[PDB]
Symmetry: C2
């Protein structure tokens, strides 16, 4: 049954299997909360805050969590509509400034000293090349905190070149659920913005002139942003050239 | 069986179900290529280039494609190891400069005029707020090309405010397969960089001084980048203020 829903290789009960549940009834008990999810296999770690009406539950696999979220979100429980969402990932880190010779496996080996790793991936572009950025997800939050603190306050190197890894807690974007219409607040500004439907503006119209100015601002930002990035690249290249010179004399025992 | 592997809601045979297969034998036929994937349900669209030894196949669901990729990549077929990867997404678009009142459903409705939509999502941050960016994936490449061309050369508005959508072909990053170690070229530079293992540099050492300079360059880029973004925000705010003034007189039939 439910073990067919695991992805190839997938480990069980990971941080990505954790659901948030809100708007629970006042008399909710832990066993009643578990029973809500009994259909979706054996429960993992469970927490409830009865007074504030919310809890967390880890399910076996990502697919089971998605099924549970889809079937239970916005359904009634004793007079209130439950709110079932994927929980935030507070044991995940973004890592940047990776040498292109850092792999998934090396990234995992390096950060495994701080604690058990659930996920360690080097992000690659649509040409298969390292972007210099990656993600490390720890099984526990203290381990992710230790890794962020040690790498921020000191110099953590993954390769011979002294290229320090830059670590920040992951600020994950959501491109699967997105912004559903029923989750958009239908305030006064909402109804104002929806008065006119999607449309093309004609040259010379009211809208067209302002919109072309808006395009121009965005193009100016793109140009200025690339200037910043190119200056960074040139500064990196100058530093790398200087380090290489010194490294060759260092290896000759002259430094 | 294989219909349990569909995600909740998921449509079948989408662009995200398309696999690339390389290093096929010289005598490959289309029916032999289909037979390689016979275990994974009914095949969708299939293409082969016999002379260059590669083909594409769409499978029913994303989960089936991942199973097929995991089981067939780097396996022998008549003397050569097959290369099975997820195909590139050339009918997908990135859309930016979205008003925060654009939902998944409005984005889909707007771009559905160019052709059938497989996916339309507004990307939200870890606070559930619109990032101003989204993804639109068309069932066909001509439709995605039409949408990119019309929105680039003209002014496409989704709301009353004349905020133009900025459309570019999607440059998708990969955070699932990542950069596996066996896909890293083990050239001379590779072995040089792996000589020293992951480690912390001590203050006053060779490595530490250069690495702190590297951190400083990255901090300077962060600061300069935020300056560019804040200048963009202020310019947007000034334009929005001017448009609002004019819109109120426009609605009074004075403009």
């Amino acid at each position: 049954n439910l073990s067919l829903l695991r992805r190839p290789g997938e480990k069980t009960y990971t941080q990505r299997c954790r659901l948030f549940v809100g708007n629970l009834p006042a008399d909710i008990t832990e066993d009643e909360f578990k029973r809500l999810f009994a259909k979706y296999g054996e429960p993992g770690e469970v927490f409830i805050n009865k007074g504030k009406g919310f809890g967390f539950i880890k399910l076996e696999s990502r697919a089971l969590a998605e099924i549970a979220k889809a079937e239970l979100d916005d359904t009634p429980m004793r007079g209130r509509q439950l709110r079932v969402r994927f929980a935030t990932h507070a044991a995940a880190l973004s890592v940047r400034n990776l040498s292109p010779y850092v792999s998934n496996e090396l990234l995992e080996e390096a950060f495994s000293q701080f604690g058990p790793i659930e996920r360690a991936v080097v992000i690659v572009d649509d040409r298969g090349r390292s972007t210099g950025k990656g993600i490390v997800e720890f099984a526990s939050k203290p381990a992710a905190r230790k890794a962020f603190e040690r790498c921020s306050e000191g110099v953590f190197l993954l390769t011979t070149t002294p290229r320090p890894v830059i670590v920040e807690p992951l600020e994950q974007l959501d491109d699967e659920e997105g912004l559903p219409e029923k989750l958009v607040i239908k305030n006064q500004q909402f109804h104002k913005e929806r008065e006119q439907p999607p449309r093309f503006a004609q040259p010379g119209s009211f809208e067209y002139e302002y919109a072309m100015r808006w395009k121009a601002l965005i193009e100016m930002e793109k140009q200025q942003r690339e200037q910043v990035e190119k200056n960074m690249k040139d500064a990196k290249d100058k530093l790398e050239s200087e380090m290489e010179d010194a490294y060759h004399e260092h290896q000759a025992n002259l430094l």
